[PDB]
Amino acid sequence: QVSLQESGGGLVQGGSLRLSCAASGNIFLWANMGWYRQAPGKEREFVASISLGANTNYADSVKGRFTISRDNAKNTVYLQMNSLKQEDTAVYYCAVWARYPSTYYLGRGYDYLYWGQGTQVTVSS
Amino acid sequence: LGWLDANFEKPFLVAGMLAIIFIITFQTLYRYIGVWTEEMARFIFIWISYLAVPVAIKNRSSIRVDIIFDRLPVRFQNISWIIVDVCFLTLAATVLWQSLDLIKMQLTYPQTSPALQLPYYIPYLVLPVSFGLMAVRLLQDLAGQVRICGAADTVIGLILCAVLAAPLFIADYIDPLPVLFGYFALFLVVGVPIAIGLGLAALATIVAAGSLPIDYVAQIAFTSIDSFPIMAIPFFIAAGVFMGAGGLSRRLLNLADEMLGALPGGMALATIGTCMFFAAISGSGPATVAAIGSLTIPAMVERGYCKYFSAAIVAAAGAIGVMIPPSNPFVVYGVSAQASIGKLFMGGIVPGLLTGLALMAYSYWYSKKRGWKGEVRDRNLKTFMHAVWEAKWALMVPVIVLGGIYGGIMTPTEAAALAAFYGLIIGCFVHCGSFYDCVVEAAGTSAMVIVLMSMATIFGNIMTIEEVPTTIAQAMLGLTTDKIAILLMINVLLLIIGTFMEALAAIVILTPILLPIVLKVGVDPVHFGIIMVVNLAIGFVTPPVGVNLFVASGVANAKIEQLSKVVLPLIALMLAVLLITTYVPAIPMFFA
Ligand code: NA
Fold first, then answer.
1. Helix (H, G, I), strand (E, B) or coil at A122
2. CB burial string A17-50: b at 16+ within 10 A, e below
């Protein structure tokens, strides 16, 4: 079983919250890791993702603002959130999925993301 | 109907290949000058990649491991060919039937693409058509073979395939890995092309073990190579082909002679300077040996050098082609490992220079020892500038590929596309039937790699589903935990593999397994890439399967058993550069 345990979450002043998420389980190492933010009255959108070979993919709004890294030894994904603004005040979910899509249907590939509980990231002024 | 009986597919490869070169190039030019176009190119690129296979069966030019095929008699050589067609026909039919059903289902529930808005059943018509054409070309060659072999041989070939595939259906369930590896070895050993050997191995596991639903194969095949980074393979291969056959290699060889012709052994120093200069053009080793070995080897023999030493220095000197960017193995690794190609390319520069310096110093030592000498000529600033001006077209390409990638101006696949477009421009306006034939050769060559990657993705997926990367990782850590002791074990393993397996085939098979463990102990994913490529480049000139020796031996009509001895000192000097890059990660990754 997999139980992600997001860490470093909490309210913020514009400083950085430097989110960290660590995966615990029998697995050796996740192929992919990423972050999704579900703003209030909104949808669980996409924040950032890092491949096994360290190919980082960011959402358009996040481009250049958040850097995502990982520690393969500790099995931890970091989201060095920076220059945060009131336009970004959503909860953050730590997502991790395998290298290849788990299911295919009508010629498309789908990923089954494993999810962390999340950590409210509140920002004022 | 002779034109359709032989050259039916080729017009489409030529038409499509030109399109994706123009489409991606135009996309890049407008993008830089300042989005749906990529979707079109990716769809076409999938079309030529699978249309080009039917050609590769009629030519009978599929890449494969024939270590024991050559050893076998002629009779057994024919039986091996009928088995290859039957096996490759079992794969082709299966992807045909599933591809049809997949299209029938897609018609029931329409589903459009993001940008083009095309129904997904349109771009997927490559799978039924291409494996439809593939199956007939197999039937033609199989019909020809049975005429060549006879009735006694044919039943021997067919019955053997029946016993080969019997256990998959006889037993309700068999362990996934033994079937996956057990069959992959058999197909690899018999002679089946590597790309197909993977596909049938994965296909056999799905049947006996049911690792994935059978319907996944067609969907994986199209989706596994639906990415933009993979498109840099055909672009680079085309750019090399349109320029390797040009004859600019002679212009470089003159420039290399100008620089290093004066010193003792200056001829052999010129050879290495040429291969290094031509290493920034071709992304392949054998492309470099052939493009330079054709010229320098006859010249070296005439000047007095032992032909065997000329064959040796050219084989090793050409292995730098895959190190200095561009290079296929990095692109195969960047895609299979999902690592940064823009970093792997800059990674291999320093190992490439060190290998060349290593060889040049040894050549200088050998020449001075044997009294060999270069030509006499009053080279000066005037002559050097003249030689530079002549090879300008050759020296313009490295600017584009490096400046585009290193400078952060262009994606690796964008820079690859501009190179092919440039290769065409210099491939016709500085040198129709030949040009048409070349374009078929580039597309035929690229398809040899993409089809391998698609079948590898199915293969890699079944391995991951069985937690093989962890099963290997746990064993290695338990045996030892030191990072250094680990990187030694990998480097040794690749060395043994390089004497028996192709570079690109090994990369796709092994990257899914080795990438996690080396990451656990803290090896950078890119760094492990440079190690893997440099460790496999040495595999070019290591017998028995010398990917570069064979080309050089042919250009010199030498004996591999004797050419192997001459090149052994060169292997050692490369292993010295291999260890330096592995255990001193600062310098190989000076840029990356
Ligand atoms: Na190269």
1. coil
2. bebbbbbeeebbbbbbbbbbbeeeeeebebbbbb
Domain boundaries, chain B: 2-226, 232-431+466-583
**Ligand 1 geometric centre to CA of A107 (Å):** 36
Nearest CA in chain B to A55: B339
Which ranges constitute the DSSP H helices of B150-279?
151-170, 176-190, 194-208, 216-224, 232-244, 248-260, 266-279
User: Which pair of tokens denotes residue A31?
Assistant: 């192929």
Comparing CB atoms, the residue among A51, A53, A104 nearest residue B216 is A104
Measured in Å, residue A43 CA sits from the centre of ligand 1 at: 47
- Contact predicate B535/B574, CB 8 Å: no
Domain ranges of chain A: 3-115
Whether omega for the bond prior to residue B286 falls within 30 degrees of 0, making it cis, is no
- Contacting B with CB below 8 Å, chain A residues are 27-29, 31, 51-55, 72-73, 98-101, 104, 106-109
Resolution in A, one decimal?
A: 3.0
B200 in Cβ contact with B91 (< 8 Å): yes
DSSP B498-531: HTTS-HHHHHHHHHHHHHHHHHHTT--HHHHHHH
Token pair, residue B347, equals 């990674």
**Nearest-5° Cα angle at B502, B239 to B286:** 40
How far, in Å, CA of B111 to CA of B107, rounded?
8
* Contact status, residue B48 vs residue B16, Cβ threshold 8 Å: yes
Is the C-alpha dihedral spanning B476, B490, B506, B520 positive or negative? positive
Nearest CA in chain A to B525: A53
d(CA B296, CA B310) in angstroms, rounded, equals: 8
Question: B317 burial class (0-12, 13-18, 19+ CB within 10 angstroms)?
Answer: buried
B521: nearest Cα among B568, B485, B469, B570: B485
Look up tokens 């996409």; give the residue: A46
CA of B138: how far to CAs of B5, B87, B90, B93, in Å?
Answer: 13, 10, 10, 10
Q: Which among B140, B162, B155 has a CA at the least distance from the CA of B57?
A: B140
Determined by: cryo-EM
**Nearest neighbour of B111 by CB, restricted to A73, A104, A106:** A106
Neighbours of A10 (CB within 10 A): 11
3 state DSSP class of B587 = coil
Number of Cβ atoms within 10 Å of the Cβ of B22: 15
Tokens 């998420």 -> residue: A21
Residues 6 or more apart whose CB falls under 8 angstroms from that of B337 comprise A52, A53, B511, B515, B525, B529
* Burial class of residue A83 in the structure, from the number of CB atoms within 10 Å of its CB (0-12 exposed, 13-18 middle, 19+ buried): exposed
B187 contacts B87 by C-beta, under 8 angstroms: yes
Long-range contact pairs involving B175-184 (C-beta distance under 8 Å, separation at least 24):
B175/B209, B176/B205, B176/B208, B176/B209, B176/B211, B176/B462, B176/B465, B176/B466, B177/B466, B177/B468, B179/B204, B179/B205, B179/B208, B179/B209, B180/B204, B180/B205, B180/B209, B180/B459, B180/B462, B180/B463, B180/B466, B184/B459
C-alpha to C-alpha distance for B306 and B309, rounded to whole angstroms: 5
User: What is the C-alpha to C-alpha distance for residues B488 and A98, in angstroms, rounded to an integer?
Assistant: 28
Other beta carbons within 10 angstroms of residue B381's beta carbon come to 7
Q: Do A28 and B520 touch (CB under 8 A)?
A: yes
Q: Which residues pair with A104 in a beta bridge?
A: A109
Which residue is listed with tokens 């993702």?
Answer: A49
Distance of alpha carbon B129 from alpha carbon B222, whole angstroms: 13
Q: Report helix, strand or coil for A32.
A: strand
Q: Which two tokens stand for residue B207?
A: 């049947």
Q: How many Cβ atoms sit within 10 Å of the Cβ of residue B587?
A: 11
CATH of region A3-115? 2.60.40.10
Collapsed DSSP state (helix, strand, coil) of residue A78: strand
Give the C-alpha separation, A37 to A122, whole Å: 12
d(CA B243, CA B168): 47
